[PDB]
C-alpha cells in the first residue's frame, strides 16, 4: 500500500522556476516508474512526464520539452519535476503516479494504467 | 537450452485463478524476444526491471504463474493492490521484481451460454500472503454457528464462477495472465538472455 | 437475525457524524458489509464496502469524506462521515453482502439530516370549509416529523395527511385534510392535534367556518 | 461504471394479473451478478432474486427472473395486494449499483378528484405571509395538473405540491397544492383560483375565491 505525497507547488511569476517533489511511503519506490500528470480545472488531465525505475529512461509531453526535467532519488523515495521557464499555460494541479515500467511508452500517458496516484499540488503561474 | 516460455504462454488451457499454475524456470536461456514480437499483449509491464532490457539480465531462477481473470481485474495483478483477486486469489509481494503480461482471451475462454469452468475464491476470512495458493473447498462460515460441511444460511461455498460470455463488455471478458518473477539468490545465476 | 443502525441525527453543513450498525446473527468481521443510503423519495445508492480481510471501497460521491470500519469485539460496523453536505441527507442502511447471492440482510436504517435550519415548532393554521373539506396547515417546522390526528384520534375516515414539502427557507410545511358530509359541518367540532416532538410542541387547533 | 436503467417508471396493473418489470444494463454483464429487490414504503429493501433467476430463500413462488447480457426481467406471476411496491435491480462490478426503481401501482377505474380551495387564514395574514391551498381529493389515475391563477394570470414558480400514497381501500390518490405569497402581494389581487385538469374531468374544473368577500 504505497502513498504518494506531492509538494513544492505555489504561485510563481511567468518565466520562473519551481521544483515539485513526490514522496512515496514505504521502501519499494525503486521498483516503480514515476509519472506526473497535470489538470487545469475545467480541462482534461494530461500526461506530463515519466521516469523509469532506474532513472535511465524518461519521457516528456511535447509542450514541456526542454523546460521540465523529471528526476529521482531512490534513496529518498522521492521523484522530482523541475519546472523552468514557466508559462501561464502551465497553471494546473500536478499529480504524481507510480506504476509498472511499460513495454509500450505510450501506455505511460494513460492515467488508469498506473497503480498509485497522489492527491495533487497546485501550480499557478501569473503574469 | 531455451527456456520453455511457449509452454506457458501458448498453453491450450489455463488455470482458474484460485488454483493458479506455477512453472519453475531454471538452467536455460531466457529469450524474451518471443514476447517482443506479438502485439496481442494488452498488459506488459515490469517492476524493478525494464522490459526492453530483459535479454541483458541474469537471475538465479524465474517463476512463471498463469491463470484467467476478468479484464477489470487485471489491475489487481500488481504490488499493493486490493480486491477479490489480490486479497483472496493471487497476491504479489510489496517488493515484487518481475513482469506482468496479459491478453484478452474472449475467443478461448468464453462460451455462448456462459463459461462456468473458471472460478475465483469469493469468500475468505483474511488476506492471502504473497504467492500463496489456497485450493480449499471448505464451506465458508459467515456466522457463529459451524457449517459441518453443509451449505445453508451463513454457510457458503467459497468458490464462484465468472459467467464468461463472448458478447460481454470488454471489462467482463476473460484475460489470460502470466506473471514472471525474477529470483536473485546469493548463488550462481541459471537463467540468462 | 438483525442489523440495527444508530447515530443518525441533525448536522450542520460541514459537520461530522459517526454511524454504527450492531449485528446479531452474522459476524461482521467475516462478511462483505455495505452502507447503502436513500434520500427521501429517491433511489438506493451504494456508499461504501468493507471486505472481511479489511479492503474498503467508497462511492465517488463520498470518497475522501466517509470511512467505513468495524469493531470485532462489539460485532459492529461503523461509518464515519465528515464535511457533510446537504446532499448527504438520507436514511442510512447497513447490509450484509453475499455478492453472488445479493444483499440478504438489511437494517431499517438511521436518518441523517444535513441542514442549516434551527429546530422550530410549527404554526398551525386553519383550512376552513367553504361533500365538504376542512383541514389544518402545519407550516414552518424543523425537523421532520410531525404527527397529526383529528379529534384526539376519534375522526379517522376521510383524513389525508400529506407528505411535508421542504420550503426554500429550509423549514417544512404540510397539510392534513378531512372530507365530511356537508350536512355535518355545523354539527360536530373539528380539532387537529399537531405534535412536533423535536421542539416539544403540541398544538390543538379548532377549525370553524 | 455500469448504469442500470429500469423500465417502465411506473407500472399500473391490477391484483391477480401478471407483472413484467425490466432492467437494462449499459454494458453486457454476467447474469451471475444481477439481483432484484422489493421495497415497501418506510421499509428496508427485501432481496427477491439473485443470479438473475434464482429466488432468494423464503421468497414466494410467484416471483421469477430471467435475462442475459443487457436485458433482465422480473416477473410476478399473479399479483398479490402486497406486491404493489417499488422494485430495484442491482448489478455487481467492483461494487453494487442499482437501477432507479419501478413503482407497481394498482390500476383502477378512472375517478375524478373533488376540488376545494382554501384562502389564507387571518392568523397567518397577521404574520405577513399568505398561503393559499388547493385540495384534490381521491382521484385516479395519479397524473393531474393544478394551475394557479391570480386575477386570471397563470402563476408559476410560487407553489409546491405533494401527493399521498395510493389509498389502501379505494386505490386513489390525493394531492395538496400550496401557493405562497407575501401578505403585500396577496392584497394586490382579487381573484384566487385553482384550475384542475384530469382524465376524470370532461374539461378542467376551477375553484376560486375573491379576497375579502363571501
Ligand atoms: C506462441 O506462438 C507464437 C506463434 O504464433 C509465437 O510468436 C510466440 O512467441 C509463442 N509464445 C511463446 C511464449 O514462445
XYZ file of C-alpha atoms and ligand atoms in Angstrom:
757
model
C 0.000 0.000 0.000
C 2.073 2.953 -1.344
C 1.154 6.563 -0.523
C 2.395 9.422 -2.733
C 2.535 12.947 -1.327
C 3.326 15.838 -3.662
C 4.705 19.175 -2.549
C 6.582 22.182 -3.892
C 3.699 23.956 -5.625
C 2.500 27.516 -5.311
C 2.291 30.842 -7.095
C 5.182 31.933 -9.285
C 5.700 34.607 -11.908
C 5.884 33.711 -15.594
C 9.421 32.681 -16.523
C 10.494 31.497 -13.065
C 11.287 28.030 -11.817
C 9.574 25.626 -9.440
C 10.689 22.201 -8.224
C 7.966 19.678 -7.386
C 8.534 16.647 -5.182
C 6.588 13.481 -4.558
C 7.459 11.200 -1.653
C 6.249 7.625 -1.591
C 5.684 5.934 1.727
C 7.390 2.614 2.144
C 10.548 1.137 0.719
C 9.521 -0.081 -2.753
C 9.728 3.290 -4.534
C 12.664 1.958 -6.513
C 10.516 -0.607 -8.349
C 8.165 1.864 -9.997
C 8.037 4.129 -12.990
C 7.057 7.542 -11.638
C 4.993 9.977 -13.677
C 3.476 13.437 -13.375
C 0.114 14.457 -14.748
C -1.459 17.896 -14.579
C -5.066 19.049 -14.818
C -6.394 22.550 -15.272
C -9.858 22.743 -13.624
C -12.424 22.504 -16.388
C -9.992 20.680 -18.686
C -8.861 17.132 -19.245
C -5.952 15.840 -17.221
C -2.775 15.469 -19.256
C 0.388 13.384 -19.153
C 3.473 15.485 -18.373
C 6.482 13.166 -17.861
C 7.716 9.788 -16.558
C 10.939 8.236 -15.347
C 11.654 4.517 -15.230
C 12.629 2.677 -12.053
C 16.404 3.019 -12.535
C 16.245 6.605 -13.842
C 17.647 5.684 -17.230
C 14.669 6.339 -19.484
C 12.201 9.194 -19.246
C 9.566 10.776 -21.467
C 8.008 14.233 -21.751
C 4.827 15.690 -23.193
C 5.822 17.892 -26.093
C 4.747 21.222 -24.571
C 7.243 20.831 -21.688
C 10.239 19.512 -23.627
C 13.388 21.426 -22.752
C 11.644 23.237 -19.880
C 10.786 20.442 -17.429
C 13.149 17.692 -16.332
C 11.955 14.740 -14.259
C 14.440 13.059 -11.922
C 14.504 10.701 -8.952
C 16.478 9.731 -5.859
C 15.631 6.146 -4.961
C 17.494 6.512 -1.678
C 14.887 9.146 -0.692
C 11.802 7.532 -2.279
C 11.375 10.920 -3.975
C 10.679 11.794 -7.584
C 11.137 15.384 -8.768
C 9.666 17.569 -11.513
C 11.966 20.516 -12.210
C 9.958 23.239 -13.945
C 11.915 26.036 -15.618
C 10.775 28.852 -17.921
C 7.262 28.580 -16.512
C 4.265 29.745 -18.545
C 0.695 30.704 -17.662
C -0.255 27.686 -19.772
C 1.483 25.520 -17.128
C -1.017 26.603 -14.426
C -2.562 23.352 -13.161
C -2.866 20.863 -10.343
C 0.023 18.393 -10.606
C -0.412 14.735 -9.689
C 2.191 12.067 -9.029
C 1.638 8.484 -10.159
C 3.505 5.255 -9.551
C 3.251 2.247 -11.833
C 4.954 -0.548 -13.697
C 7.713 0.044 -16.224
C 5.881 -0.260 -19.530
C 6.950 -2.072 -22.672
C 4.941 0.449 -24.750
C 5.881 4.016 -23.788
C 2.513 5.359 -24.980
C 0.897 3.496 -22.100
C 2.652 5.946 -19.756
C 0.186 8.616 -20.913
C -2.810 6.692 -19.587
C -3.733 7.699 -16.042
C -5.501 4.423 -15.242
C -2.548 2.205 -16.227
C -0.637 3.275 -13.084
C -1.042 1.649 -9.648
C -0.995 4.517 -7.158
C -1.911 8.183 -7.510
C -1.223 11.242 -5.404
C -3.696 13.877 -4.220
C -2.074 16.727 -6.176
C -0.300 20.027 -5.613
C -1.286 23.392 -7.090
C 0.858 25.364 -9.528
C -0.225 28.870 -10.549
C 1.956 30.884 -12.946
C 0.859 34.524 -13.204
C 1.912 37.408 -15.483
C 18.582 -24.932 -23.966
C 15.862 -22.319 -24.431
C 13.559 -21.594 -21.522
C 10.113 -23.113 -22.255
C 8.127 -19.872 -22.311
C 5.945 -21.118 -25.142
C 4.792 -23.952 -22.892
C 3.361 -21.322 -20.513
C 2.116 -18.584 -22.844
C 0.779 -20.809 -25.617
C -0.918 -23.470 -23.448
C -4.360 -24.566 -24.611
C -5.852 -24.464 -21.112
C -5.130 -22.030 -18.299
C -5.740 -22.423 -14.583
C -8.555 -20.892 -12.661
C -7.017 -18.037 -10.684
C -7.677 -19.628 -7.269
C -5.624 -22.678 -8.357
C -3.008 -20.663 -10.307
C -0.236 -22.612 -12.020
C 3.461 -22.051 -11.463
C 6.349 -23.179 -13.658
C 9.867 -23.056 -12.214
C 12.284 -21.966 -14.947
C 15.911 -22.990 -14.279
C 19.158 -23.625 -16.135
C 18.122 -22.283 -19.509
C 18.498 -19.283 -21.800
C 15.708 -16.716 -21.454
C 14.940 -15.392 -24.941
C 12.266 -12.810 -24.188
C 12.168 -11.961 -27.957
C 9.167 -14.239 -28.480
C 7.361 -11.877 -26.117
C 8.559 -8.835 -28.054
C 7.155 -9.845 -31.450
C 3.493 -10.431 -30.602
C 1.287 -7.350 -30.339
C -1.555 -9.271 -28.672
C -0.485 -8.198 -25.147
C -2.916 -5.712 -23.590
C -0.675 -5.584 -20.483
C 3.130 -5.796 -20.420
C 4.889 -4.018 -17.565
C 7.709 -4.740 -15.149
C 8.677 -3.800 -11.616
C 12.307 -3.151 -10.747
C 13.322 -4.134 -14.292
C 12.849 -2.527 -17.702
C 11.037 -4.896 -20.104
C 13.186 -3.851 -23.098
C 16.417 -4.772 -21.277
C 15.252 -8.286 -20.276
C 17.606 -10.134 -22.649
C 20.506 -8.460 -20.841
C 19.631 -9.887 -17.433
C 20.585 -12.946 -15.363
C 18.654 -14.489 -12.487
C 19.047 -17.422 -10.155
C 15.558 -18.558 -11.169
C 12.423 -17.414 -12.910
C 8.927 -18.403 -11.835
C 6.032 -18.149 -14.320
C 2.493 -18.065 -12.901
C -0.569 -18.232 -15.115
C -4.362 -18.059 -14.738
C -7.564 -16.431 -16.073
C -9.315 -13.415 -14.502
C -11.726 -10.880 -15.900
C -10.466 -7.756 -17.611
C -11.486 -5.292 -14.893
C -9.387 -7.433 -12.534
C -6.063 -7.333 -14.384
C -5.096 -4.134 -12.455
C -5.029 -6.136 -9.167
C -2.009 -8.052 -10.521
C 0.483 -5.514 -9.144
C 2.050 -4.954 -5.710
C -0.095 -3.247 -3.112
C -3.431 -3.834 -4.811
C -6.716 -4.772 -3.162
C -9.697 -6.676 -4.484
C -11.125 -10.153 -4.631
C -8.207 -11.322 -6.777
C -5.335 -9.648 -4.919
C -6.854 -10.289 -1.475
C -8.178 -13.809 -1.954
C -6.707 -15.346 -5.079
C -3.231 -14.177 -6.219
C -1.054 -11.785 -4.181
C 2.165 -10.179 -5.292
C 4.692 -9.139 -2.632
C 5.143 -5.427 -1.978
C 8.755 -5.637 -3.232
C 7.969 -7.698 -6.327
C 10.645 -7.959 -9.012
C 9.329 -9.211 -12.336
C 6.815 -8.578 -15.090
C 3.069 -8.879 -15.659
C 1.748 -9.808 -19.107
C -1.898 -10.293 -20.018
C -4.012 -10.646 -23.129
C -7.700 -10.805 -23.948
C -8.827 -14.414 -24.264
C -12.527 -13.994 -25.043
C -12.053 -16.334 -28.029
C -10.683 -19.245 -25.998
C -12.194 -18.707 -22.604
C -15.781 -17.545 -23.122
C -18.803 -19.692 -24.097
C -22.226 -18.891 -25.553
C -24.373 -19.760 -22.569
C -21.572 -18.830 -20.244
C -18.343 -20.463 -19.286
C -18.635 -21.753 -15.755
C -15.361 -23.714 -15.680
C -13.264 -20.714 -14.489
C -13.514 -19.928 -10.771
C -12.323 -17.447 -8.189
C -12.491 -17.578 -4.397
C -15.178 -15.141 -3.307
C -15.285 -15.917 0.448
C -12.188 -15.982 2.660
C -11.735 -14.818 6.244
C -8.457 -12.964 5.649
C -5.957 -11.918 3.009
C -3.550 -14.204 1.184
C 0.159 -13.964 1.792
C 2.268 -13.168 -1.289
C 2.461 -16.077 -3.758
C 0.045 -18.101 -1.643
C -2.252 -20.596 -3.353
C -5.417 -21.586 -1.478
C -7.248 -24.515 -3.040
C -9.522 -25.175 -0.052
C -13.193 -26.017 -0.730
C -14.323 -25.820 2.886
C -17.780 -24.358 3.398
C -17.306 -20.754 4.447
C -18.676 -19.818 7.897
C -20.218 -16.335 7.901
C -21.902 -16.505 11.291
C -21.132 -18.049 14.680
C -22.570 -21.462 14.018
C -20.472 -24.250 12.448
C -21.364 -25.418 8.961
C -20.186 -29.015 9.313
C -19.626 -29.329 5.575
C -23.221 -28.304 4.741
C -24.293 -25.303 2.673
C -27.015 -23.048 4.007
C -27.583 -19.768 5.779
C -24.194 -18.313 6.792
C -22.623 -21.394 5.126
C -21.435 -20.642 1.587
C -19.319 -22.494 -0.908
C -16.118 -20.386 -1.159
C -15.601 -20.618 -4.953
C -17.782 -18.918 -7.569
C -17.886 -18.729 -11.327
C -17.438 -15.993 -13.838
C -20.149 -16.049 -16.396
C -17.815 -15.598 -19.337
C -19.891 -14.910 -22.448
C -18.364 -13.860 -25.799
C -20.676 -10.855 -26.065
C -19.827 -9.421 -22.620
C -18.340 -5.961 -22.355
C -14.576 -5.883 -22.627
C -14.075 -5.386 -18.881
C -16.100 -8.534 -18.223
C -14.231 -10.678 -20.748
C -11.649 -13.268 -19.688
C -7.964 -12.404 -19.778
C -5.052 -14.774 -19.622
C -2.261 -13.656 -17.296
C 1.395 -14.689 -16.938
C 3.486 -13.295 -14.080
C 7.277 -13.624 -14.400
C 9.053 -13.342 -11.039
C 12.833 -12.955 -11.110
C 14.668 -14.589 -8.186
C 18.132 -13.362 -7.193
C 19.807 -15.505 -4.521
C 23.382 -15.357 -3.249
C 24.226 -18.095 -5.716
C 25.177 -18.581 -9.366
C 22.615 -17.486 -11.940
C 20.976 -20.186 -14.059
C 18.747 -18.101 -16.358
C 20.297 -15.533 -18.700
C 19.475 -13.921 -22.034
C -31.032 -12.220 12.822
C -30.883 -8.443 12.501
C -28.759 -5.359 11.862
C -29.550 -2.190 13.845
C -28.131 1.222 12.813
C -27.604 4.106 15.269
C -26.101 7.580 15.261
C -28.365 9.368 12.811
C -29.287 12.905 13.609
C -29.200 16.520 12.613
C -25.922 18.017 11.388
C -24.905 21.448 10.155
C -23.358 21.659 6.675
C -19.710 20.781 7.184
C -20.151 18.920 10.486
C -19.260 15.325 11.248
C -21.318 12.271 12.132
C -20.487 8.680 13.059
C -22.987 5.925 12.380
C -22.937 2.470 13.892
C -24.606 -0.811 12.983
C -24.811 -3.581 15.597
C -25.300 -7.063 14.178
C -26.973 -10.203 15.563
C -26.776 -13.491 13.681
C -23.954 -12.607 11.283
C -20.332 -11.954 12.131
C -19.468 -8.504 10.858
C -15.756 -9.303 10.541
C -16.499 -12.369 8.400
C -18.589 -10.604 5.730
C -18.677 -8.120 2.972
C -20.640 -5.317 4.654
C -22.184 -2.269 2.948
C -23.603 1.113 3.816
C -26.441 1.971 1.402
C -28.345 5.249 1.691
C -31.651 6.519 0.304
C -32.571 10.168 0.088
C -36.283 10.890 0.610
C -38.293 9.934 -2.461
C -35.119 8.791 -4.262
C -33.448 5.503 -5.138
C -30.841 3.404 -3.389
C -27.216 4.481 -3.592
C -24.309 2.335 -2.545
C -21.908 4.238 -0.319
C -19.115 2.002 0.972
C -17.997 -1.604 1.260
C -15.616 -3.399 3.631
C -14.178 -6.880 2.949
C -13.742 -9.409 5.723
C -9.996 -9.203 5.144
C -10.112 -5.394 5.503
C -10.144 -3.941 1.984
C -12.529 -0.978 1.745
C -14.268 0.825 -1.123
C -16.250 4.053 -1.467
C -18.621 5.629 -3.951
C -17.158 8.624 -5.777
C -19.709 10.973 -4.170
C -18.193 10.327 -0.709
C -14.555 9.387 -1.347
C -12.353 11.419 0.951
C -15.186 12.165 3.379
C -16.531 8.783 4.594
C -14.658 5.981 6.398
C -16.123 2.519 6.853
C -14.752 0.465 9.748
C -15.755 -2.165 12.279
C -15.233 -3.401 15.830
C -14.818 -7.155 16.148
C -15.297 -7.099 19.927
C -18.704 -5.413 19.585
C -19.702 -7.157 16.313
C -20.447 -3.672 14.983
C -19.918 -1.793 11.720
C -19.243 1.952 11.628
C -19.421 4.723 9.079
C -17.547 7.966 9.770
C -18.866 10.984 7.824
C -17.004 14.307 7.542
C -17.505 17.536 5.580
C -21.198 16.634 5.427
C -23.248 18.338 2.711
C -26.957 18.902 2.240
C -26.876 16.182 -0.462
C -25.903 13.546 2.122
C -29.340 13.862 3.711
C -30.676 10.318 3.663
C -31.637 7.183 5.511
C -28.515 5.096 6.055
C -28.769 1.293 5.985
C -26.114 -1.275 6.657
C -26.497 -4.612 4.879
C -24.674 -7.938 4.706
C -23.458 -8.574 1.158
C -23.081 -12.089 -0.335
C -22.169 -10.637 -3.815
C -23.303 -13.593 -5.984
C -26.231 -14.093 -3.625
C -27.097 -10.390 -3.258
C -27.646 -8.435 -0.038
C -29.858 -10.690 2.058
C -29.905 -8.901 5.450
C -30.634 -5.175 5.828
C -31.179 -2.837 8.742
C -34.130 -0.490 8.977
C -31.625 2.352 8.849
C -30.957 5.598 10.684
C -31.751 9.012 9.234
C -29.104 11.730 8.727
C -30.311 15.295 8.047
C -27.781 17.919 6.930
C -29.191 21.415 7.164
C -28.528 24.918 8.478
C -32.086 25.215 9.783
C -32.689 25.514 13.527
C -35.259 23.228 15.070
C -38.565 25.128 15.283
C -42.131 24.177 16.126
C -44.924 24.643 13.609
C -47.519 27.324 13.381
C -50.837 25.529 12.771
C -53.379 27.411 10.665
C -56.998 26.504 9.854
C -58.126 25.425 6.389
C -61.752 26.462 6.865
C -64.653 24.943 4.904
C -66.269 26.963 2.094
C -69.191 16.774 0.493
C -67.191 19.387 2.386
C -63.450 19.600 3.084
C -61.574 21.151 6.007
C -58.060 20.890 7.307
C -55.046 22.248 9.103
C -51.968 23.892 7.597
C -48.901 22.898 9.633
C -46.334 25.439 8.480
C -42.658 26.240 9.117
C -41.321 23.443 11.336
C -37.907 21.672 11.580
C -37.016 18.863 11.660
C -39.302 16.074 10.460
C -41.612 14.578 11.611
C -44.958 15.869 12.851
C -47.908 13.704 13.793
C -51.444 14.848 13.063
C -54.637 13.387 14.457
C -58.205 14.649 14.291
C -60.494 14.948 17.321
C -57.937 13.301 19.625
C -57.975 10.282 17.322
C -61.734 9.784 17.037
C -62.102 11.101 13.465
C -60.171 8.841 11.096
C -62.041 8.114 7.868
C -61.729 10.717 5.145
C -58.444 12.016 6.600
C -55.491 12.731 4.311
C -52.263 13.898 5.902
C -49.888 14.839 3.151
C -46.116 14.354 2.987
C -44.309 17.527 4.001
C -42.617 19.781 1.451
C -39.256 21.386 2.099
C -39.574 25.132 1.513
C -36.822 27.351 0.164
C -36.497 28.615 3.755
C -35.388 25.160 4.897
C -38.484 24.656 7.080
C -41.145 22.057 6.392
C -44.825 22.590 5.733
C -47.639 20.065 5.354
C -51.401 19.820 5.210
C -53.837 17.455 6.837
C -57.387 17.490 5.484
C -60.615 15.602 6.063
C -63.763 15.479 3.957
C -67.121 15.159 5.724
C -70.722 15.249 4.502
C -71.710 18.862 4.036
C -74.695 18.405 6.342
C -72.366 17.570 9.247
C -70.401 20.817 9.002
C -72.278 22.585 11.776
C -72.927 19.538 13.971
C -69.533 18.374 15.283
C -66.435 20.260 16.286
C -63.251 19.557 14.291
C -59.857 19.851 16.008
C -56.486 18.911 14.549
C -53.956 17.587 17.058
C -50.453 18.516 15.950
C -47.378 17.250 17.756
C -43.757 18.131 16.976
C -41.539 16.047 19.261
C -38.183 17.675 18.374
C -39.356 21.095 19.567
C -41.750 19.681 22.173
C -44.690 21.446 20.511
C -48.244 20.103 20.818
C -50.962 22.256 19.265
C -54.701 21.734 19.275
C -56.354 23.947 16.656
C -60.121 24.080 16.161
C -61.297 24.656 12.591
C -64.531 26.508 12.011
C -66.432 28.014 9.082
C -19.368 2.285 -14.266
C -22.326 0.088 -15.216
C -25.551 2.113 -15.442
C -28.774 0.225 -14.720
C -31.924 1.582 -16.372
C -35.282 0.201 -15.299
C -38.493 0.267 -17.298
C -41.187 1.469 -17.007
C -41.053 4.213 -14.393
C -44.479 3.174 -13.122
C -46.423 0.022 -13.946
C -50.178 0.182 -13.477
C -51.670 -3.300 -13.155
C -54.491 -4.964 -11.222
C -54.297 -7.713 -8.491
C -54.166 -11.201 -9.917
C -52.573 -10.078 -13.192
C -49.052 -10.872 -14.375
C -46.356 -8.219 -13.939
C -43.215 -7.917 -16.042
C -40.515 -5.453 -14.976
C -37.381 -4.701 -16.978
C -33.803 -3.864 -16.120
C -31.323 -2.752 -18.777
C -27.554 -2.577 -18.322
C -25.282 -0.121 -20.148
C -22.886 -2.997 -20.931
C -23.368 -6.755 -21.290
C -22.585 -8.428 -17.983
C -22.556 -11.833 -16.376
C -26.042 -12.685 -15.198
C -24.403 -14.179 -12.070
C -24.154 -10.686 -10.529
C -27.689 -9.366 -11.034
C -30.233 -9.252 -8.203
C -33.765 -7.889 -7.668
C -35.163 -6.214 -4.541
C -38.598 -5.154 -3.354
C -39.055 -2.114 -1.114
C -42.255 -1.142 0.587
C -42.863 2.401 1.872
C -40.862 3.073 5.022
C -39.227 -0.364 4.940
C -35.814 -1.781 4.181
C -35.398 -3.473 0.787
C -36.104 -7.213 0.611
C -33.955 -9.381 -1.662
C -36.061 -11.374 -4.133
C -33.750 -12.768 -6.825
C -30.015 -13.402 -7.169
C -28.060 -14.729 -10.136
C -30.755 -13.176 -12.376
C -33.008 -16.186 -11.941
C -32.579 -17.803 -8.505
C -35.231 -16.966 -5.957
C -33.787 -15.970 -2.600
C -34.660 -18.198 0.305
C -38.214 -17.704 1.608
C -39.391 -15.753 -1.457
C -42.859 -16.863 -2.661
C -43.266 -18.815 -5.875
C -44.965 -16.126 -7.934
C -41.603 -14.275 -8.295
C -39.116 -15.312 -11.001
C -36.357 -13.753 -13.078
C -34.614 -14.225 -16.409
C -32.449 -12.442 -18.972
C -28.832 -12.180 -20.083
C -26.278 -9.639 -21.243
C -28.015 -6.278 -21.097
C -31.680 -7.301 -20.668
C -33.094 -8.781 -17.464
C -36.621 -9.351 -16.292
C -38.537 -9.711 -13.067
C -41.898 -11.446 -13.424
C -44.656 -11.675 -10.825
C -46.923 -14.495 -11.921
C -50.139 -13.216 -10.311
C -50.041 -10.038 -8.275
C -50.989 -10.041 -4.597
C -52.155 -6.780 -2.967
C -48.830 -6.762 -1.075
C -46.811 -6.744 -4.341
C -47.581 -3.102 -5.141
C -44.308 -1.536 -4.040
C -41.028 -0.399 -5.577
C -38.578 -2.833 -7.224
C -34.868 -2.306 -7.862
C -32.390 -4.322 -9.849
C -28.751 -4.492 -8.823
C -25.564 -5.361 -10.640
C -22.092 -6.009 -9.260
C -18.921 -4.726 -10.884
C -16.289 -3.637 -8.414
C -19.224 -2.689 -6.178
C -23.036 -2.668 -6.270
C -25.051 -0.273 -8.390
C -28.832 -0.106 -8.509
C -31.407 0.731 -11.119
C -33.557 3.751 -10.380
C -36.646 1.737 -9.416
C -40.048 0.815 -10.848
C -43.234 1.547 -8.890
C -46.005 -1.041 -9.163
C -49.308 0.724 -8.575
C -52.853 -0.600 -8.612
C -54.801 0.044 -11.796
C -58.361 1.115 -11.195
C -61.331 2.759 -12.896
C -60.941 6.474 -13.566
C -62.126 8.707 -10.717
C -62.301 12.484 -10.883
C -60.884 14.491 -7.998
C -63.167 16.662 -5.995
C -61.612 20.110 -5.665
C -61.582 22.556 -2.750
C -59.743 25.860 -2.349
C -58.736 27.374 0.993
C -57.891 31.085 1.436
C -55.143 32.094 3.865
C -56.325 32.430 7.447
C -56.348 35.877 9.051
C -53.996 34.467 11.686
C -51.336 33.701 9.101
C -52.047 37.052 7.411
C -51.015 38.721 10.675
C -47.606 37.075 10.205
C -47.013 38.768 6.851
C -47.350 35.636 4.695
C -50.258 34.214 2.668
C -50.608 30.507 1.860
C -53.459 29.551 -0.490
C -54.143 25.796 -0.513
C -55.880 23.692 -3.148
C -57.010 20.128 -2.387
C -57.662 17.346 -4.929
C -59.408 14.501 -3.119
C -59.446 10.795 -4.002
C -58.780 10.647 -7.755
C -57.276 8.138 -10.195
C -55.012 7.959 -12.179
C -52.223 9.888 -10.473
C -51.495 12.269 -13.359
C -53.136 15.610 -12.549
C -52.466 19.277 -13.353
C -53.020 22.037 -10.814
C -52.853 25.513 -12.374
C -52.890 28.539 -10.069
C -54.486 31.702 -11.429
C -54.444 35.106 -9.732
C -56.667 37.707 -11.386
C -56.566 35.194 -14.286
C -52.759 35.210 -14.769
C -51.267 31.727 -14.650
C -48.974 31.545 -11.620
C -45.700 29.737 -11.992
C -42.814 29.358 -9.552
C -44.542 30.071 -6.209
C -46.332 26.789 -5.407
C -45.400 23.370 -4.062
C -47.252 20.048 -4.360
C -47.359 16.763 -2.543
C -49.341 13.572 -3.107
C -50.477 10.783 -0.793
C -49.664 7.142 -1.299
C -52.306 5.226 -3.206
C -55.162 4.617 -0.778
C -55.276 1.086 0.695
C -59.085 0.867 0.360
C -60.058 2.649 -2.899
C -56.659 2.864 -4.648
C -56.986 6.615 -5.356
C -54.554 9.455 -4.753
C -54.960 12.843 -3.164
C -52.946 15.963 -3.838
C -52.295 19.174 -1.933
C -51.045 22.330 -3.656
C -49.859 25.434 -1.802
C -49.380 28.835 -3.390
C -47.335 31.112 -1.134
C -47.031 34.870 -1.380
C -46.278 37.746 0.937
C -49.249 39.478 2.527
C -48.467 42.555 0.444
C -48.623 40.617 -2.833
C -51.736 38.858 -1.577
C -53.512 42.182 -1.085
C -52.717 43.479 -4.610
C -55.072 40.952 -6.290
C -58.741 39.970 -6.094
C -59.417 36.522 -7.606
C -57.569 33.430 -6.368
C -58.304 30.295 -8.375
C -57.218 26.658 -8.610
C -57.817 25.036 -12.024
C -57.563 21.228 -12.150
C -57.045 19.162 -15.321
C -57.604 15.421 -15.016
C -58.645 12.471 -17.127
C -61.762 12.112 -14.956
C -62.934 15.644 -15.807
C -64.569 16.358 -19.168
C -62.892 19.745 -19.001
C -60.788 21.453 -16.327
C -62.543 22.463 -13.102
C -61.896 25.751 -11.301
C -62.489 26.638 -7.674
C -61.881 30.221 -6.671
C -62.484 32.873 -4.075
C -62.449 36.680 -4.175
C -60.187 38.081 -1.470
C -62.228 39.546 1.373
C -65.642 38.505 0.015
C -68.034 35.723 0.967
C 3.476 -18.652 -29.146
O 3.443 -18.885 -30.555
C 3.627 -17.694 -31.334
C 3.465 -18.092 -32.783
O 2.113 -17.982 -33.205
C 4.992 -17.081 -31.031
O 5.123 -15.857 -31.744
C 5.145 -16.831 -29.537
O 6.471 -16.402 -29.248
C 4.842 -18.101 -28.751
N 4.907 -17.846 -27.320
C 5.986 -18.114 -26.579
C 5.879 -17.788 -25.120
O 7.004 -18.598 -27.064
